Amino acid sequence: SVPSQKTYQGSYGFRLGFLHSGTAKSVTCTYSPALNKLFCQLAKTCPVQLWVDSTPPPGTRVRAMAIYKQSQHMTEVVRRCPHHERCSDSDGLAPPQHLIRVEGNLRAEYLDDRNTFRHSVVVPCEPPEVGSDCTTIHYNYMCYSSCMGGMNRRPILTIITLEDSSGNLLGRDSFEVRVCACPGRDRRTEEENLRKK
Numbered sequence: 001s002v003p004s005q006k007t008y009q010g011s012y013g014f015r016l017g018f019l020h021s022g023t024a025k026s027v028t029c030t031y032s033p034a035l036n037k038l039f040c041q042l043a044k045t046c047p048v049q050l051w052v053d054s055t056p057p058p059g060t061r062v063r064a065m066a067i068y069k070q071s072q073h074m075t076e077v078v079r080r081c082p083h084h085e086r087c088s089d090s091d092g093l094a095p096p097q098h099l100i101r102v103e104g105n106l107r108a109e110y111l112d113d114r115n116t117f118r119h120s121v122v123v124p125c126e127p128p129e130v131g132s133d134c135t136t137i138h139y140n141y142m143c144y145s146s147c148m149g150g151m152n153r154r155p156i157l158t159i160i161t162l163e164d165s166s167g168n169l170l171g172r173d174s175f176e177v178r179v180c181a182c183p184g185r186d187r188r189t190e191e192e193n194l195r196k197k
C-alpha cells in the first residue's frame with residue numbers, strides 16, 4: 001500500500017542527476033542537494049538526468065511516481081486537485097488527474113494502477129547520445145504543492161525506478177518536490193532554515 005523509496009543503484013549503477021540552475025528570482029526549476037529537493041514552477045520543464053555505469057538491456061524503462069512524504073499521508077494517492085483535474089490543459093496523452101507528465105516523448109505511457117490506484121508515467125530508457133554521458137527526461141508537475149483539495153501543502157517525493165520489460169525493479173532513486181511560484185526564493189529559505197537547525 002506504500003511504494004518503496006529506498007535508494008538502489010542495482011547492477012547498472014543507476015542514479016539521478018540535476019542541473020545547477022541557481023536561486024535567482026527568475027529561476028523556474030532548481031535543485032537543492034543539501035535538501036535533496038527540487039523546487040519548480042507549475043507546468044514548467046524539470047530536467048532530470050539519468051546516469052548509469054553500464055547500459056541496461058533493451059526494453060528497460062524509467063518510471064516516475066509521486067507519494068506523500070509524511071508517513072501519516074503516505075497511503076493517499078497523490079493526484080491533481082479538484083480545480084486542475086478539470087482545467088482542460090491536456091497534452092493529448094496524460095490523463096488530466098496525473099500530477100507528473102513527461103514532456104516531448106511520444107513513447108511515454110501513463111498508468112492508473114488497477115490495485116493501488118496510484119498514477120505513474122513511464123518511458124523507455126534511452127542510452128546517451130553521441131557526445132553525451134547521460135540522458136535527460138523532462139518532467140512537468142501539474143499542481144502547486146499548496147493546491148487545496150490536492151496536495152494541500154503536504155510535501156511529496158518523486159520516486160524514479162529503472163525497470164525491466166516486465167516491470168521488475170532494476171534501480172531506484174528519489175527526491176522531494178515543492179511546486180511553487182518562486183522556487184529560487186523558497187530554495188534559499190529552506191536551505192537557510194536547514195543551516196540554522
Ligand SMILES: [Zn+2]
Nearest residue numbers: 081084143147
Ligand atoms: Zn492544483
